[PDB]
Design a protein around this ligand. Sequence first.
Ligand SMILES: Nc1nc2c(ncn2[C@@H]2O[C@H](COP(=O)(O)O)[C@@H](O)[C@H]2O)c(=O)[nH]1
Ligand SMILES: Nc1nc2c(ncn2[C@@H]2O[C@H](COP(=O)(O)O)[C@@H](O)[C@H]2O)c(=O)[nH]1
Ligand SMILES: [K+]
Ligand SMILES: [K+]
Ligand SMILES: [Mn+2]
Ligand SMILES: [Mn+2]
Ligand SMILES: [Mn+2]
Ligand SMILES: [Mn+2]
Lengths: 270, 270
Amino acid sequence: SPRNCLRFTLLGCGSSPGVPRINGDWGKCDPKNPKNRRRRASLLVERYDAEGNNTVVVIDTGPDFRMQMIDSGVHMLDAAVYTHPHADHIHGIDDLRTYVVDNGRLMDVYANRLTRNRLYDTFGYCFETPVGSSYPPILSMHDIAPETPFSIEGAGGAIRFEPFSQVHGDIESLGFRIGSVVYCTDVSAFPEQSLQYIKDADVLIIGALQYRPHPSHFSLGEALEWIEKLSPKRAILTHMHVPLDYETVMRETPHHVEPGYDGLRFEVAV
Amino acid sequence: SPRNCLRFTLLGCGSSPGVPRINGDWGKCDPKNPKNRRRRASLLVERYDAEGNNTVVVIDTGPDFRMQMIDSGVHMLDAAVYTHPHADHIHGIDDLRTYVVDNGRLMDVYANRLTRNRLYDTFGYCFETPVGSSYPPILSMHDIAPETPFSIEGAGGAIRFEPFSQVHGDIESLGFRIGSVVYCTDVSAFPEQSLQYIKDADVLIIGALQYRPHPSHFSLGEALEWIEKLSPKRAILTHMHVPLDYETVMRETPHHVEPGYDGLRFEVAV
Ligand SMILES: Nc1nc2c(ncn2[C@@H]2O[C@H](COP(=O)(O)O)[C@@H](O)[C@H]2O)c(=O)[nH]1
Ligand SMILES: Nc1nc2c(ncn2[C@@H]2O[C@H](COP(=O)(O)O)[C@@H](O)[C@H]2O)c(=O)[nH]1
Ligand SMILES: [K+]
Ligand SMILES: [K+]
Ligand SMILES: [Mn+2]
Ligand SMILES: [Mn+2]
Ligand SMILES: [Mn+2]
Ligand SMILES: [Mn+2]
């Protein structure tokens, strides 16, 4: 059992349609390598104390959330933190309901104004019972904003997040630093003020969609450029689309850089 | 390869949180029997011609839709038909996008007014590009209503659906007859006018949630009562929650009645 650590699990490392796409398209990925089967992008963040008690926080609840949590072996949850309101990051939100019953209290969720306002539109019944329904709400909303740290409490002690702004095509997404681990998905550019949060990470988890440019995400080359500038000790690529084959990308990248895979898990000192 | 037939695949046969729940709760289900692992409720409907060309229609696109379609081995889709606007039946809707690209045209979806109006609220971006976005819409909406048959065209020939009203707790859901196969999920009572569509089926797929009463679904006993009255040649139970173990329910039910399982597949004459 883990003790005296943060533990991170890469729940999903795929692009918005997953790998393979729903039509069975693997792109250039080797279908025989299980590491190329990719769920939608999400990160589990845990803190364990000396006795193995844990605080558990998920970053994003996409459509794969339920299977991600089942397969993680972690059976409790303290909070959900959201990057931005795109389908692949939010459409598994209803599956928070079981934990509300287990915990006997609303699930604390964390989101910026843009994300929160879209969740209210799309998933109002999670916040407020609509006319003609008997379903109680399940979520308790908390604001977050770039450059304002926030902490989530739980049985393993507090987990402190440092959110920051990312450009994501035509909208803003959030990245987060947790200790010396940084999570940057759905990003096409980093604003100058965000650099302090992303440099000198022990582990930088950074989105690299594909080889060719895309308006909303870094290409592999752009991600590598950023990794060279930010000098993380280790980098892990995420939000990888069907052009990016695990073995191939492993070869093409520096030794301290690797494509992620679903279930990739590591512990770090608190 | 299939020929000259309708083919039905039970894509999912679970209750709204799946089996096991996200917290790893299997209830009374034997976790060692793969048939007890249940995705959210959905049915694939295909028509094959003499040369093996197919028309493909899905009933409901819940969170498991992508994996359901991948695992089905069927890599194309002509339409989606919706029963009612509950999370477990609609929150995988974004994953229709790949087929829109493949088909070069909007995905035809079919829904009653209640369902359509909720989809417009929750998933507006699928119908109409919102302010500040460049994402084109992906869906083309068609009305359906109880007692009004409708047909979907495709490469395998037309598939004719006969929709009818079901009581589902505080709302209405739709059931459908396709030839002599009937699909009745999320139903707590059948209105008198719907009986003509449900009697004398070759195969009746009918929701049975659990043993104890529930306001929104038939219990196993209630489902069996209905099966005795409607005299289907074969019945398959669906939308089964964690109290209902496959082997156990198999024993407890008449020979012509069985609990479903994900991937359950059969062909019938056109
Ligand atoms: N919930 C939501 N999803 C959107 C919206 N516009 C696009 N999407 C979906 O969000 C995803 C964008 O994927 P990305 O390439 O940023 O990972 C796709 O699944 C796309 O269909 C929107 O306005 N709301
Ligand atoms: N999309 C949507 N889902 C709902 C609403 N109210 C309840 N739900 C969800 O719909 C499901 C109801 O499940 P049922 O027991 O009918 O299979 C649960 O996942 C529940 O959280 C609603 O107003 N809209
Ligand atoms: K490498
Ligand atoms: K039986
Ligand atoms: Mn994304
Ligand atoms: Mn995005
Ligand atoms: Mn349901
Ligand atoms: Mn329902």
